[PDB]
Amino acid sequence: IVGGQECKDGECPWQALLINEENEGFCGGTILSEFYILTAAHCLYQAKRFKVRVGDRNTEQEEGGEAVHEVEVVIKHNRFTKETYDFDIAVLRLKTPITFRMNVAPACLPERDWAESTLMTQKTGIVSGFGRTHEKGEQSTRLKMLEVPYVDRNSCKLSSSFIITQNMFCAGYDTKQEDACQGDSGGPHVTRFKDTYFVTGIVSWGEGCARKGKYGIYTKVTAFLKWIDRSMK
Amino acid sequence: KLCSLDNGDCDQFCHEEQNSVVCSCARGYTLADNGKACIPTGPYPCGKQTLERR
Numbered sequence A: 001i002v003g004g005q006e007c008k009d010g011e012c013p014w015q016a017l018l019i020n021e022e023n024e025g026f027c028g029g030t031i032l033s034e035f036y037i038l039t040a041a042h043c044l045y046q047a048k049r050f051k052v053r054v055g056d057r058n059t060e061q062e063e064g065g066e067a068v069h070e071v072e073v074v075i076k077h078n079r080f081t082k083e084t085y086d087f088d089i090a091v092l093r094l095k096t097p098i099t100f101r102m103n104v105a106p107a108c109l110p111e112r113d114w115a116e117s118t119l120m121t122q123k124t125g126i127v128s129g130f131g132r133t134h135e136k137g138e139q140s141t142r143l144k145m146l147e148v149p150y151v152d153r154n155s156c157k158l159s160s161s162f163i164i165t166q167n168m169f170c171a172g173y174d175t176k177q178e179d180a181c182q183g184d185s186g187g188p189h190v191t192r193f194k195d196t197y198f199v200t201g202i203v204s205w206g207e208g209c210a211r212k213g214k215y216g217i218y219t220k221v222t223a224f225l226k227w228i229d230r231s232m233k
Numbered sequence B: 001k002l003c004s005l006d007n008g009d010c011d012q013f014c015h016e017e018q019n020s021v022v023c024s025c026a027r028g029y030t031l032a033d034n035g036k037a038c039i040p041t042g043p044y045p046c047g048k049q050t051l052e053r054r
Ligand SMILES: O=C1[C@@H]2[C@H](C(=O)N1CCC[N+]1(CCO)CCCC1)[C@H](c1cc(-c3ccc(Cl)s3)on1)N1CCC[C@@H]21
Pocket: A082, A083, A084, A085, A135, A162, A179, A180, A181, A182, A183, A184, A185, A203, A204, A205, A206, A207, A208, A209, A210, A215, A216, A217, A218
């Protein structure tokens, strides 16, 4: 996360971190239930093997509330395309269930039509993660969050060197230096409605991070709410 | 009455019928008797920050 702020205690409890062969984070995820994590399909190609950590705010401090879970099943979207990152969505079933507790709770899945009329029409959503703090920088050891404006599709398309499909949406800023970045991808984009946070996006890709005239690109979760339900059985 | 004005007074999901609105809630909540509020069924309902340290 470029700009934004450190997440306060209890404020990002649905954040998950995918950890590679080293316990180093390389992608985010979103807790959906005791057994399921939402992430980006492209994250599945970026480490040979990985596990999921929940409850962490500081990767250099053993707080006491952190837990690591192995992955039982990876459910990738069968239309995911590496070239374009279209259909950039996957669900992970964990081998053992998450125990909800301080800093560990699921985000809500909204009903589709209401999400479209009520969540996607809000001014902003929130993105979070442990990713880089500037494009060419290092990953944050502390969990960060950032309020990102929704950006209209026409503007989104004009700004991008790559196709923006209807499975994607833009969020962020034209010139203000705040964005998600490498290491945040796969993580949550949530939208607040009367103090409840609903999953609206998956951090997917960008052309650099926080570049002028470029936005953050997110998987449009509304297009996949039925797919998520089926994947979770 | 309409979901476009104050979300039909619903705490979470709102849908319009012929004359009325119907509210509903995410899994882990029960719709309150008043037909508007969403009441968590457990201590870690979805979408809530974990602020009340138990
Ligand atoms: O090249 C990179 C990588 C990676 C990334 O997405 N890009 C763009 C990939 C672009 N596509 C493939 C290459 O053509 C084309 C469209 C879909 C993927 C990475 C990155 C950028 C981001 C985000 C920025 C804003 C977000 Cl929201 S996510 O997350 N990871 N860039 C920063 C450092 C390296 C470079």
